[PDB]
Design a protein around this ligand. Structure first.
Ligand SMILES: [Mg+2]
Ligand SMILES: [Zn+2]
Ligand SMILES: [Zn+2]
Lengths: 90, 1342, 99
RNA sequence: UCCGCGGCGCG
DNA sequence: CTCTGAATCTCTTCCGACGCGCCGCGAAAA
């Protein structure tokens, strides 16, 4: 349960960037089928998206670095697949 | 997707408007009735506006999607979606070119200003009552004169085809085709340089700005006349089907059919080459028909239908509350909404609201479908609809699942303030009424009188996050109007708390000592000790250390067992001393605020919930109730009334004996009745407040009475002193609707029986109050709407602006008391400078620091008097304000965050109290202190007293700490009994004056010799009737003779031998003019002393209209005249009906002259020197005068002072910032005196931001900047002056805004919030702001 | 009364008003300013674009909700297009810029 | 059936 | 004694919360 979010606001500072970053995290949670970084206790995606902010393990910076490592790892996997295909063709 | 940058508006050229059309329409028919199909060439033609059904040809030849984009060969109708019926517009060609109504008639007539013609002759021309002439050859008569018929004839016989004259409609465009605007603009420019008249320059300036706008914008003026008229697509004007195949006609269709009829008739009439009379009448009829089509009703009687209704035009569909803008664009009706009546839910928590099960099902049906598909129970949406209709038991479980954390927005109509919409996390209840948490009922301004409210549900994850973060009732517990908490317990809870904490001197189980509150609970719940018993108990309390650690302490202290019970629910950080009192609403408010300021938000929320529960519980157990025996009537009442009866009887007899007048008797009767009322009220309160009780020893004691009504009123739970006074004592001396007191008192109380005449008198005030309350809402709403629409643009963008100008602040003192302390007025502001310790140069508070509570405590300790703080009125940020100038954010305690729309918040915070408003000789020092005199030039008379020789002199009372507490105005020539800096006590007189006489004074001693003393030309000899004393009466300028009109009677100070006496410090001899109608008792050549006098000169608004006028900057009906330039005052040559006031500057070269109506009593003497902006006469001062004389800071101090005064009289608290921000938006525009190196023109009005940044870049280039003045535009005018034309069009005055924007080709950058909300993209504020900061970064990069 | 999804007015594609015709509530300008003050711009945009006017957007949104995805799909309100056409009928050129 | 206008009350 | 400018008077325009609920009823057009 979450009765108020003021602690998370303190963690992020401005409420608006808080809500934006939490929205991005929850959106990648719902459609990406990602993993919740905190035990969910059968809570909805939105509130656990706030809770991970409450822990402080995630913010805009960590969100950005995670998304960037994911995308360049996908790029590297694609490059490895292309290299394997070329080796098979050669 | 389209991501269009901006919106451009321009005139519709005939060629391009032809391109817009998919074709023309020939017949005035709509559909067939045999088959409901459009006619071959009607207003619904399938060839023209598209198919009647999606992807189906008109003749049915092709009926498959593969035929997309195919125009049927058999019938010629394109096969596509029916959506194009909304897109494709028709057009009509007119047999005669016809002008637009707007540009013709909207004042000022744009075509009229384009030409030099007056509007009247051109309009009578365009309706074909006169010709217009294009010159060729050498007649006496030139071009562009108006020529009637027989003059046209005699000119035709005299001159033939040498010259051209024409009837209106085509002649207007023909002439419009016959000018070059460049030669026109240059010739008018050189005329402007040539001319001297101000009105002439006004006319030519407006003309030149208009035509240069045409030139720059590239639109051709000849386009103003229409040769082609576009027809709106049929889908926007549907022909509504009715029962039996009948139809209801949309209004546009009738007007369009009329125009088609007239046009076709004119075409066939011209084809037959009929004489000119027929064609001219037909074409003028077509002109009026198209006039009605465009803007029906603007000119003449609007065309009407069989229903005698005035038919709607295109123009009427945009303008007005019912128009497209207000009705549709803003306030679109929404899906997923419900509405229901409210019900108190006591068992709820603070943030969860009870929702009817059926409403929850309907609102969340999309989610029920989604989860049912998720669990696979429903294979198809049809199945989902079945089971959701079949209310299978699984559906309810799913419903509980989906709403587990999904908040809903909840609104009560009408929203008055931002606390009017709150989000709750719902729970399901049976029934058909929304359960609401009791606390927020105060915030919603609900009263549970069958009032309805609505519910919406957010859909996106984003919106849910905004709801849970922003709108959740757990947050925003502090109102934005003022920091006071909004969730305040009241009524039953207050009653329960007060009854719980109250003590009784004798009670069961008193005296026993008890270990702790747990055992107190045990004792009372066992019924072994009453709630009011006073006992000694052990308690423990905790406090934050320097590190915030809760250090503990404990001890034994006296406590009522009820208060001991209360101590359970207190949070761990509260000190005990707060609870130790007779709790009331004010105390409880201080309590909750205390725990909010000390502990975190969660402790306060939990504490509020628990106090709610406990208050209700112990109020329930109280059983406090009102009985008929409670309103005890004092026995003294009969006696007091008897005494008053005698007093009035004897007074009436004294009036009948002729000893006193009717008005005097009226006044003293009112006085004695008021005294009687005071006596009886005091006696009744005394009897009620105290009760006789028995102690442990049986001895008589006294205690605060437990009478039900007394405790109800004392606690503040829905009551006050006035009502209890009316319950059992006198009802008072209220007035008639005219305001006159009826002079016959309302005797009995409500427990007694009010007699028929008594009650019928009592009803007048009730009816007046009810009517006023009912009628005020309209004006309050309107004022709010205007304020919001003025302030909608502002949003905090920059963190700081590098500026150091600011606003001086000092506590407001009126009538000898401080109306608002400096603590309040400066709390939450940002320091404008380095605050200095009093008497020292040491820095007390550094610059640019927030004034939170500790800093204000430090300032109070140092007893600082005045301080300078930054204000939004001084902000330098362009197109916005910085955070620091707006200072602290009220609702969150910390500094404001970027992206908060302060303007709308402030507008609503002004508006909300708007409901509460109501629209229908000597000076005593009150306290011990030191006398201070300011703005004074004073002398000491021969009597040893003090006389003032200056205006606007002010008398202050200042403490030893240097803080003023009393302030009064000093009348000119008054007698002052104390020196400067002298100490005085309260209730002490210090100065005296005659209120109804304007005296004169003489600082020097000497023989007064009278000059210009002539009977009938300057003065007259008179003898006082009552005393026989000789006197001279100065005659008026017209009372005297014509020859003596300009003669100036005056006193001259000389020595005993007549040698001139000079003014001290100057070489000028002392001469005092004699004003008209003045009287003097002394005679010529009489010695007087220093500081000596000889002269005999003779001496409301409702609240809501007052604030409306102040914000609108109404010119008062009686304005005070203020001096323009500092110099010696004089009267010029006498004028007719007015006096010629002249100022000769002390060092300026140009004297100044003003006409002032003769009836005005000028405050300043003629023989006086004034400073810039001196007050010449009494009366309210128009704010524009303040702005142009005393600068912006004076205006922004004045407006806030007055508005805060009105609200303070009403008692509603509101922070000065909200007034300041509005005023800042009021000063938008500015005019230019000298353009310097800018491209602007002198006398033009532009944006203050635009001229400021122009000066900035000009001096950055080293070039000459613009010299400007700032003009005070009223809220309506300032709203119409916004750069974005869309916002102005949405506001009001739509026709003029649209016309001006179209004529000028303005480009709207959709900057403001209202325009963006119109467009539908995210507004640039709050959560959206970051997105726009993500956009403007990259669009500039792209 | 509770509306959710239902009939739409033909002229402006907005939902009907009135319980008798199963119409939704009205989110008047007062509520617009109420949201404006709090911020919550996303909620306001959702209100205006999907739940009220944009037919394409509200259809896509309905499909998304049925699918469990809760992503916004903004779009130009049809009422604004109506206004554009109406002004274009007046004999005034109004158009979008930087298209 | 979905359109428009007038009157009445509620908050 | 006449002409022009400045100022007032006269006319015209705009506009007074909002949310519902209820009720009834369209046509010389077909
Ligand atoms: Mg009410
Ligand atoms: Zn066909
Ligand atoms: Zn600033």
């Amino acid at each position: 349960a979450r009765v108020t979010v003021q602690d998370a606001v303190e963690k992020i500072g401005n409420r608006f960037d808080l809500v934006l970053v939490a929205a991005r995290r929850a959106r990648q949670m719902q459609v990406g089928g990602k993993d919740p970084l905190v035990p969910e206790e059968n809570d909805k995606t939105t509130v656990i998206a706030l809770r991970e902010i409450e822990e402080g393990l995630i913010n805009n910076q960590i969100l950005d670095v995670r998304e960037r490592q994911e995308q360049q790892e996908q790029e590297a996997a694609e490059l490895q697949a292309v290299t394997a295909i070329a080796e098979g063709r050669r | 997707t389209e991501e269009f940058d901006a919106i451009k508006i321009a005139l519709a050229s005939p060629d391009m408007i032809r391109s817009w059309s998919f074709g023309e329409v020939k017949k005035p028919e709509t559909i067939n009735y045999r088959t409901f199909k459009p006619e071959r060439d009607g207003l619904f033609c399938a060839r023209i506006f598209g198919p009647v059904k999606d992807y189906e040809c008109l003749c049915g030849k092709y009926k498959r999607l593969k035929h997309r984009g195919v125009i049927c060969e058999k019938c010629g109708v394109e096969v596509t979606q029916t959506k194009v019926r909304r897109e494709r517009m028709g057009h009509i060609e007119l047999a005669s070119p016809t002008a637009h109504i707007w540009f013709l008639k909207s004042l000022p007539s744009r075509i009229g200003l384009l030409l030099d013609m007056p509007l009247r002759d051109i309009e009578r021309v365009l309706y074909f009552e006169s010709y217009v002439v294009i010159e060729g050859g050498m007649t006496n008569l030139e071009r562009q004169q108006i020529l009637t018929e027989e003059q046209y004839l005699d000119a035709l016989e005299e001159f033939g085809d040498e010259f051209d004259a024409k009837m209106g409609a085509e002649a207007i465009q023909a002439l419009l085709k016959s000018m070059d605007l460049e030669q026109e603009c240059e010739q008018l420019r050189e005329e402007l340089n040539e001319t001297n008249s101000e009105t002439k320059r006004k006319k030519l300036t407006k003309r030149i700005k208009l035509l240069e706008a045409f030139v720059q914008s590239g639109n051709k003026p000849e386009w103003m006349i229409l040769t082609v008229l576009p027809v709106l697509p049929p889908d926007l004007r549907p022909l509504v089907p009715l029962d039996g195949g009948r139809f209801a006609t949309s209004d546009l269709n009738d007007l369009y059919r009329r125009v088609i009829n007239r046009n076709n008739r004119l075409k066939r009439l011209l084809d037959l080459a009929a004489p000119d009379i027929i064609v001219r009448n037909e074409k003028r009829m077509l002109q009026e028909a198209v006039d009605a089509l465009l803007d029906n009703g603007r000119r003449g009687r609007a065309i009407t239908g069989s229903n005698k209704r005035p038919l709607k035009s295109l123009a009427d569909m945009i303008k007005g509350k019912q128009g497209r803008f207000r009705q549709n664009l803003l306030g679109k009706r929404v899906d997923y909404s419900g509405r229901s009546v409210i019900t108190v839910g006591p068992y709820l928590r603070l943030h969860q609201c009870g929702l009817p099960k059926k409403m929850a099902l309907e609102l969340f049906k999309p989610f029920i479908y989604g989860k049912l598909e998720l669990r696979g129970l429903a294979t198809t949406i049809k199945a989902a609809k079945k089971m959701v209709e079949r209310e299978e038991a699984v559906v309810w479980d799913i419903l509980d699942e989906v709403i587990r954390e999904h908040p809903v927005l909840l609104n009560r109509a009408p929203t008055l303030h931002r606390l009017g919409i709150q989000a709750f996390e719902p729970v399901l209840i049976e029934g058909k009424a929304i359960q609401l948490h009791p606390l927020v009922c105060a915030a919603y301004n609900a009263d549970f009188d069958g009032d309805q409210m609505a519910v919406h549900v957010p859909l996106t994850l984003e919106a849910q996050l905004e709801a849970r973060a922003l709108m959740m009732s757990t947050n925003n517990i502090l109102s934005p109007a003022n920091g006071e908490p909004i969730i305040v317990p009241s009524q039953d809870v207050v009653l329960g708390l007060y009854y719980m904490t109250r003590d009784c001197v004798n009670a069961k189980g008193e005296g026993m000592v008890l270990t702790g509150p747990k055992e107190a609970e045990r004792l009372y719940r066992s019924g072994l000790a009453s709630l009011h018993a006073r006992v000694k108990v052990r308690i423990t309390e905790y406090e934050k250390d320097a590190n915030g650690e809760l250090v503990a302490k404990t001890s034994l202290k006296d406590t009522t067992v009820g208060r001991a019970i209360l101590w359970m629910i207190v949070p761990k950080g509260l000190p005990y001393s707060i609870v130790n009192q007779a709790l009331g609403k004010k105390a409880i408010s201080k309590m909750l605020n205390t725990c909010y300021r000390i502990l975190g938000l969660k402790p306060t929320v939990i504490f509020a919930d628990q106090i709610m529960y406990t208050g209700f519980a112990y109020a329930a157990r109280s059983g406090a109730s009102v009985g008929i025996d409670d309103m005890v009537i004092p026995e003294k009442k009969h006696e007091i009334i008897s005494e008053a009866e005698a007093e009035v009887a004897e007074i009436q007899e004294q009036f009948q004996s002729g000893l006193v007048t009717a008005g005097e008797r009226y006044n003293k009767v009112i006085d004695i009745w008021a005294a009687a009322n005071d006596r009886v009220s005091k006696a009744m309160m005394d009897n009620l407040q105290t009760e006789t009780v028995i102690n442990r020893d049986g001895q008589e004691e006294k205690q605060v009475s437990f009478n039900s009504i007394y405790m109800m009123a004392d606690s503040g739970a829905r009551g006050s002193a006035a009502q209890i006074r009316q319950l059992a004592g006198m009802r008072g001396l209220m007035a008639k609707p005219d305001g006159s007191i009826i002079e016959t008192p309302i005797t009995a109380n409500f427990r007694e029986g009010l007699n028929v005449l008594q009650y019928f008198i009592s009803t007048h005030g009730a009816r007046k109050g009810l009517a006023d309350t009912a009628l005020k809402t309209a004006n309050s709403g309107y004022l709010t709407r205007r304020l919001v629409d003025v302030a909608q643009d502002l949003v905090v963008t920059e963190d700081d602006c590098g500026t150091h100008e600011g606003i001086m602040m000092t506590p407001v003192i009126e009538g000898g008391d401080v109306k608002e302390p400096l603590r309040d007025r400066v709390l939450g502001r940002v320091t404008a400078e380095d605050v200095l310790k009093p008497g020292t140069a040491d820095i007390l508070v550094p610059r640019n620091t927030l004034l939170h509570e500790q800093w204000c405590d430090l300032l109070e300790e140092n007893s600082v008097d005045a301080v300078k703080v930054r204000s939004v009125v001084s902000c330098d940020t362009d197109f916005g304000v910085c955070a620091h100038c707006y200072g602290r954010d009220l609702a969150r305690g910390h500094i404001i965050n970027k992206g908060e729309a302060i303007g709308v918040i402030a507008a609503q915070s002004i508006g909300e109290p708007g409901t509460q408003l109501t629209m229908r000789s000597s000076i005593q020092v009150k306290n011990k202190g030191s006398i201070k005199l300011s703005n004074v030039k004073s002398v000491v008379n021969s009597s040893g007293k003090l006389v003032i020789t200056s205006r606007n002199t002010e008398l202050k009372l200042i403490d030893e700490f240097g803080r003023t507490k009393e302030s009064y105005k000093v009348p000119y020539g008054a007698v002052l009994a104390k020196g400067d800096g002298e100490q005085v006590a309260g209730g002490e007189t210090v100065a005296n004056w005659d209120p109804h006489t304007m005296p004169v004074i003489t600082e020097v001693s000497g023989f007064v010799r009278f000059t210009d003393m002539i009977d009938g030309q300057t003065i007259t000899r008179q003898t006082d009737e009552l005393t026989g004393l000789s006197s001279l009466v100065v005659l008026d300028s017209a009372e005297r003779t014509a020859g003596g009109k300009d003669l100036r009677p005056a006193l001259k100070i000389v020595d005993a031998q007549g040698n001139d006496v000079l003014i001290p410090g100057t070489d000028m001899p002392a001469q005092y003019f004699l004003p008209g109608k003045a009287i003097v008792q002394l005679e010529d050549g009489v010695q007087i002393s220093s500081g000596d006098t000889l002269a005999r000169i003779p001496q409301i608004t409702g609240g809501l209209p007052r604030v409306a006028d102040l914000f609108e900057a109404r010119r008062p009906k009686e304005p005070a005249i203020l001096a323009e330039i500092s110099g010696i005052v004089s009267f010029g040559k006498e004028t007719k009906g007015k006096r010629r006031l002249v100022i000769t500057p002390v060092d300026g070269s140009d004297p100044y002259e003003e006409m002032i109506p003769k009836w005005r009593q000028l405050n300043v003497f003629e023989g006086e020197r004034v400073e810039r902006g001196d007050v010449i006469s009494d009366g309210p001062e128009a704010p524009h005068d303040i702005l142009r004389l005393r600068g912006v800071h004076a205006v922004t101090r004045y407006i806030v002072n007055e508005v805060q005064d009105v609200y303070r009289l009403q008692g509603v608290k509101i922070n000065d910032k909200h007034i300041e921000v509005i005023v800042r938006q009021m000063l938008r525009k500015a005019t230019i005196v000298n353009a310097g190196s800018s491209d602007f023109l002198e006398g033009e009005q532009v944006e203050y931001s635009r001229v400021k940044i122009a000066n900035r870049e000009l001096e950055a280039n080293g070039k000459v900047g613009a010299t400007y003045s700032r003009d005070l535009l009223g809220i309506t005018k300032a709203s119409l002056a916004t750069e974005s034309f869309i916002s102005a069009a949405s506001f009001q005055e739509t026709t003029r805004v649209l016309t001006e924007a179209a004529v000028a080709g303005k480009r709207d950058e959709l900057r403001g919030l209202k325009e963006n909300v119109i467009v539908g993209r995210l507004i640039p504020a709050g959560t959206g702001y970051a997105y726009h900061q993500d956009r403007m970064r990259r669009r500039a990069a792209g | 009364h509770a509306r959710s999804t239902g009939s739409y007015s033909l002229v402006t594609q907005q939902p009907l008003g009135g319980k008798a015709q199963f119409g939704g509530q009205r989110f008047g300008e007062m509520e617009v300013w109420a949201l404006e003050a709090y911020g919550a711009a996303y909620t306001l945009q959702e209100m205006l674009t999907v739940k009220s006017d944009d037919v394409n957007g509200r259809t896509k949104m309905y499909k998304n909700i049925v699918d469990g995805n809760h992503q916004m799909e903004p779009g130009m309100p049809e009422s604004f297009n109506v206004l554009l056409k109406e002004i274009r009928s007046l004999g005034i050129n109004i158009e979008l810029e930087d298209e």
